[PDB]
Amino acid sequence: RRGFLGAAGSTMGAASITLTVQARQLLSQHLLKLGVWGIKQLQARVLAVERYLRDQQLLGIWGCSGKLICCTNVPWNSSWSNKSLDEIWNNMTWLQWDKEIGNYTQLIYRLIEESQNQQEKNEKELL
Amino acid sequence: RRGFLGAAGSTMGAASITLTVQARQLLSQHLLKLGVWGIKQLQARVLAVERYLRDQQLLGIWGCSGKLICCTNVPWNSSWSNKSLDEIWNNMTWLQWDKEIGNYTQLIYRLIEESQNQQEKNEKELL
Amino acid sequence: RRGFLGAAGSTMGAASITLTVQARQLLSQHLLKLGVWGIKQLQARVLAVERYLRDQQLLGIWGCSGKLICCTNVPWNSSWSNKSLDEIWNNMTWLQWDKEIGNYTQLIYRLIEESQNQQEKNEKELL
Amino acid sequence: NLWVTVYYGVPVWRDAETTLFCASDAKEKHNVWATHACVPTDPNPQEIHLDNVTEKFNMWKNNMVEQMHTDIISLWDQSLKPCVKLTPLCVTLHCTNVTDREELKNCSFNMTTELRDKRQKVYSLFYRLDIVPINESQGSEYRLINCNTSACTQACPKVSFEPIPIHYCAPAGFAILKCKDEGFNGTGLCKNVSTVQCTHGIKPVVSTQLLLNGSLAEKNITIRSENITNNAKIIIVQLVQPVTIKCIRPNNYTRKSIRIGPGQAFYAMGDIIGDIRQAHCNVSRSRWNKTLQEVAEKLRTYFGNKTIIFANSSGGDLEITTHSFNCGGEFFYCNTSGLFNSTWYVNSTWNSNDTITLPCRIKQIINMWQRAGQCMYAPPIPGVIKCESNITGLLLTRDGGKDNNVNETFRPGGGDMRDNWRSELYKYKVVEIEPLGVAPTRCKR
C-alpha cells in the first residue's frame, strides 16, 4: 500500500483502489503572531479550506456528496473521447486522460448540474 | 435560461427549476499583502465560507445534505399559513412567501431537527 | 430537554437522544479592524471552521455525511473492549468510554476507510 | 395532508451590510488608491435583468456610500504612511514679494541636512494661502499654515492622484441590486430592477459644488434629495449634457529638491519662468447657462410657478466656498460666482464662444476630508499642466427664507464628501441572499 499520491503511475483501473488516501490528505501553536510566517500560514489555511469546499460544493449540487464514486444520468458523448473502455481503464493513466478531457471538463460539469436538478424536481415536488 | 438570481420574479412553482444556478454561485493573486484592500478581501473570503457552512450545516443535521429538495416528517401546521396549495405554488412567488414564514422559520427549523434525530435513533441503534 | 452538552452525565443510551443539540452548536460587526481583539476573533472564526471541516471530512470519506448515526462494515474486535452490550449502553457514559478507545481510535478510523472504498469499487465501477 | 419541504438555492434576499472589496483592470506607476493591490476585474462581468421584480431603494440610507467613504480615507492614509513627514519644515519663514500678483511669496528659511552637525539656508516660493504671519515682526516673518496643529506629510512623487475607476464587488452569497428604471430619483420602489456582482467603474473624483467625470443622466435632468422641502438637505442634480470645463496652471515653475535629512528630501517650487499668470478655468457660456434654464425649469416643478435664482456660495471655508478639484497633482480652488449668477422667470429663455473664466487659487497644504490635523503637502508638478473635465452634476443648497415670496434662491453648497459617492451609488444596494427556503407540498407519495 503506497502513501499519498503514490498511485499516480498506475493504470486507471488500479488507481481507483487508493482514492481514500488522496481524499483524506486534502486538509492534512494555537495563537497567531500574524508576522511574515504567520501571514503565510493564515493564507495557506484559508486557501486549503476554500480548495476543499470548491470541490466539495460541486459534489453537493451533483448529488454525490459523501461518495467517492458516483454515476450520473449524463451519457458519454463519443465526441469528447472515442477511445474504448478496455484501453482507458487498463492501459491509460489518469494523468494522460486529464489533458484529453480538460477541453470538455467545463461542459461536462454543467451538463451534470441540470441533469440532477431536473431529476430532483421530477421525483420530488409532487405538486 | 436566465442567469444568476434571474428567476426571482417567477412564481414558486417555476422558480424551483433553476435552484442549481443560485446554489452554484454561493462560493463564486495567491499572495496577500494584508493592506486596506487585502484585509477587506480576506474578511469577504472568510465571511463567504462561513455563510456557506452556516446553511450547509443545517442541511447536514436535517439529513438533506447533497439534496436540492427534500421532504421531512414535520407536517405543515395550518397556523403558519393557510394559503391553498394552488395559489401558493402557481400564483405567489418566493419573495412574498419569505416574509410570511419569517415569523415561524425558527420554530420550523427546530421541529425538523428533533424529528430527524428521533427518526435516526429509532431506525438505527437497534440496541 | 437539557441544553447544550447537558447530557454529558447521562448513560450512553440516554445521551444519544440529544446528539442534535451538540451537533448544532459546532459553529455557533461586519467590518474587522484586525486589532488585538480582532486578530483573536479572526483566528477563533477560522479555527472553528477548520475544526468543523476536520470532523466533517472524516464522515465524508466514511460515507456517513449528513447522518448523525451510521453503521459500517468493520466488525467490533473484542480486543479493543470486551465489555457486554448491556452495561456499555445502559451503565457506562460516553466520557468513561472515550478514555478506553483512545488507544484504538486511530486504528478504527483507518479501518473504516478501505472498508468503504472497497465497497464503492465493488458496487460501482462495473467495468 | 401536507408535509414541510426545505429548498436550497431559493431566489430570495434581504437588506444587509458586508465588506465590499475592490476590483479593477490591473496592469506601472502606483496611485494613491492602491488599485494594483486589489482583485483584477473580469473582462465580461455578468448582469442579469430581473423580470417581474420591483424593489425599494434608498440612496440616503445606503451603507455602500458610508463604507466607501471609510475605504477612501483609509487608502489616503495608507499611501501617505511610507512618505517622508515634513516635521522640520515648521520653522520661521522670511518672505518677500515675488520679483493681483501677491498670490505667491518668495520665502527663505533654515533647514537641516543629512549631516546632523550641519544646517543649510534655502529658499522656495509658497502660495499665500499656505502661509500664516507670526505677527511678531509684522510683514516679514511667517510660518506654514496648520503648523500649530499637525506636521503635514509630503505626498510621494512616485504615486499619482489619478482617479482610475474601481469596482465594488460583494462577497459570495450576496449580490448588488441595480435599478434600471428610467429617470429614477434615487428613492422609492424601482419598477425596473437588475442584479450584478460588481458595480460599474466608480472614479473617486474628489470635487466640491460640481461633480466632475461622473455619470450622466439618461434622458432628463434628474434631481435628488431626501426631503426637497427641507432647507438643510443638499440637492443633487444630474445633467444630461456634459458641460466641458478646461482648467490650466500657466505658471512654469522649476522643481528643486533639497535633502532635509538622511535619505529624504523636500520638493518645492523654485523660480518662475517668464512672468506670473493667474490660473483659471474656461467653460462655454451658451452651453453652460443653457443647462441652468433646464435646471431651473426642472426645479420649478417642485416649487410651483415661482422663479429660480442662483447666487454664489454664502461664505466660510475655502473648500466649501470654491469649486475644489485636482488636475492630477495640483489642487485647484476656483470661484463659481460667475456661474451661479442669474435669475430665471417662468417664461425666461436662454436664447460664438464667450467662454466664462473662473479665477482659481492653488494650495499645497491641504486637508481632504475636513479632519483636524492629518494634513498633506502636495509637491509641485513641473511645467504647465492642463486638465479637461466633464461637469455632470451640481450640489445645490436652498436658502431658508419665509418661502412665501415669488422667487426662491439656490446656492452651490459643498455639503458632505459622501455626496460625491452618493451621486454614483444611488443606483445600487447590497442584499444578502437566503438560499434556504421552506414551503409545503404533498410529498411522500
Added chain:
Amino acid sequence: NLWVTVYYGVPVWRDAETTLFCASDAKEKHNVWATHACVPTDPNPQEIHLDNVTEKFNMWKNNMVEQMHTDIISLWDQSLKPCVKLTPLCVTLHCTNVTDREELKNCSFNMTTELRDKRQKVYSLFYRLDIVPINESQGSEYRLINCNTSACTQACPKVSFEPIPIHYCAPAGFAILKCKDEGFNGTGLCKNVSTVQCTHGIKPVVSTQLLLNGSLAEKNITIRSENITNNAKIIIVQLVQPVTIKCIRPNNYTRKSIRIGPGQAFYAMGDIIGDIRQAHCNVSRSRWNKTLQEVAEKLRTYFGNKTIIFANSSGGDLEITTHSFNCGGEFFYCNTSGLFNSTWYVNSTWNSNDTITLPCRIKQIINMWQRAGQCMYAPPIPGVIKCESNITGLLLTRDGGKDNNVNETFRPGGGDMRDNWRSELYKYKVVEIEPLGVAPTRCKR
C-alpha cells in the same frame, strides 16, 4: 451504452503557485529568520516514490525561488524594524590612522545622549570601506558611507544571523514533486520522480561566487544553466567533494556601548588588543586545484576540445567582485583571485598542506539585497571568531568570446541572489492536485 462518472481523490496534478509556509525544529535565542514563529517540523516527514511516473522540471522558471527571495527579504526587514535606527550617527568624523595596516581608522565624533540638553564626544574604530571623506577637508572630517542615501538600522545584538535550516511546506491540497534522477541537470523530463509535503532543510546561507554549506552532488560534478551557449547566463556547478574553507578574524576588539538616546545605545569597536592582523581564509591547494581539473574537464564536454581558463572577476561592486559571506556576525569580503587563476589543457592533470590564503575585508555598513537605502549596521562581535564552511558549488560566468578561439575563459560571477536559492530548489516544484476526475463506464446496471 456508457455513462459519465466522477471520481473524487484522483491522483492528478497541474503546475500552480501558492503561499508556502515555513517549517523547522523550533524550540532560546532568536534569529534574523524568525524560525521560532513558524510551524514546527514533523519528526518523521513522509516521502513517497512515484513508480512509472516521469515529470518535467524547470529550475529557471520555478516560482519557489522567486517566492523564497521575497520571504527572505521580508524577514530581514521584519527583524530590523524593532531595532534602534542609527540616525544621529550621520555626523562629521575626525579620523586618524590606528596607533597594509590602513584598513582601520580611529575616528572621534560628537554624539547625542539621554539628556536632550547635553552632548558627548566619543571615539571608535571604523573600517575604511564603511567611511567616505567629505573632500572639503583633507585627512579628516569623514562621514559614514551611504549616509547621503538612508540611515542604517543597527542590527539587534540579541538576534543571531545563524542560517538554521527551514523547510518549505505546501498547503493542504497541494504537493511538492522531487526529482530523484541521478545527475539531473535541473531541466527536462525527470525519469525518477518522488513527492513530499515539505522540502528538505534549506539553509539561507547568503554567499557570492561560492556556495557554502549547500547540498553536494550525488555522483558527478553537475553543471546547470538555462542556455550554456549564452554568455549572459550564469553557470551553476555542484561539487561532489566538499572543499573545506577555514576563515578567521584575528583582531580582538573591545566592544563599547554608548547611549545615543533614551533607552537606546550604539555598539562600536573599541581599541584592538595586541596588534593589527589581516583577516583571511585558508583552503587546501591539493584538494582545491584537484576539483578545478574535474570542473574543467566536465565543462570541456560542452565546448569540444577547447581548453578551460579561470580568471578573477572583471571588476565592479565589492559584493560581486569578492566572495562575500558571514561568520555568524561579521560580513567577510574575500578576494578569490588566488583560486580562479589557472589554465587547463585537454591532457592537463593536476598531479603536503600548501594552503591557499585569501585576503579579506570586513564591513559594518552593508546592503544585503543590492537595494538602494535600507542599509544595516552590523555590531562588532567581541573576541576572535572562526568559521569553517563547506564549499559545495560555484557561480561561473563565461566571457563573450568570438567562438573561434582554442580556449574558453570563466569568471566567478556574483549573478543574482536568487541563484543561491535556485541551487537548492532545482530539485523541487509545486503542483496543485485535482482530486475531481471524470471518466466513463458502463454503470447503472
